[PDB]
């Protein structure tokens, strides 16, 4: 099965129970892969596609990072949370640099978001 992204976004947002942590970690991995693939669209200055991708992945991450806290052991659960917050902040900056678009600042926030999500995958394992 695919476990997500198989119907309209509003139906999965409002009329679905949610994801288990074992699927939330996979959605984290898929979000990281999509962010890695977004580089070519960032270089071609297609701000609408990038902003759609960023909003959708933000809406995924707000649920997935919260529900994947269980898989993180207790010895790291605070630090992971910090990393999660960092990722959110980075994506917020990325948001702020795709709407009201800038090239250099959006690229900087893109690299920061990639590093933050790689740290988040390192914590999730």
């Amino acid at each position: 099965e695919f476990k997500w992204g198989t119907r309209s976004f509003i139906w999965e947002r409002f009329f679905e129970p949610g994801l288990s942590p074992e699927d939330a970690v996979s959605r984290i991995k898929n979000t990281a892969e999509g962010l890695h693939s977004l580089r070519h669209m960032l270089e071609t200055m297609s701000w609408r596609y990038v902003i759609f991708y960023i909003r959708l992945k933000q809406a995924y991450l707000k649920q997935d990072m919260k529900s994947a806290m269980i898989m993180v052991p207790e010895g790291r659960r605070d630090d992971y949370s910090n990393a999660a917050n960092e990722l959110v902040d980075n994506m917020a900056e990325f948001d702020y640099y795709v709407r009201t678009p800038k090239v250099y600042e959006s690229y900087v926030s893109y690299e920061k978001t990639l590093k933050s999500i790689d740290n988040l995958l390192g914590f999730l394992a």
């Binding site: 309209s8 976004f9 509003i10 297609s46 609408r48 596609y49 759609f52 909003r55 959708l56 809406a59």
Partner: protein, 100 residues
């Protein structure tokens, strides 16, 4: 984001316009509901051009042409309404059932 909700509204408009097309006891109101249906179609076209056609803008051009056609219909009637009111002095369309 929840952009797909726009599609939902468009569908609603279509159905509402369709409803207003049938229960119309005034042909001016039927013309207005025709405008409603064309507006729902235009909403679908514009949001699809936003979704998939950021460069070519084919949906926006089609929306402009649909607006042109809707205005042409709105020019042809109520001129037809003018002829009907000059000949019959009544607008209620369900009352005219001579051809049956």
């Amino acid at each position: 984001m929840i952009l797909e909700h726009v599609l939902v509204l468009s569908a609603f408009l279509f159905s509402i316009g369709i409803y207003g097309l049938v229960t119309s006891r005034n042909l001016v109101r039927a013309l207005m509901c025709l405008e409603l249906i064309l507006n729902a179609v235009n909403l679908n076209f514009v949001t699809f051009s936003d979704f998939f056609d950021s460069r070519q803008l084919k949906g926006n051009i089609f929306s402009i042409f649909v607006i042109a056609i809707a205005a042409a219909e709105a020019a042809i009637g109520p001129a037809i309404v003018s002829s009907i009111y000059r000949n019959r002095k009544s607008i209620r369309i369900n009352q005219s059932n001579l051809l049956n």
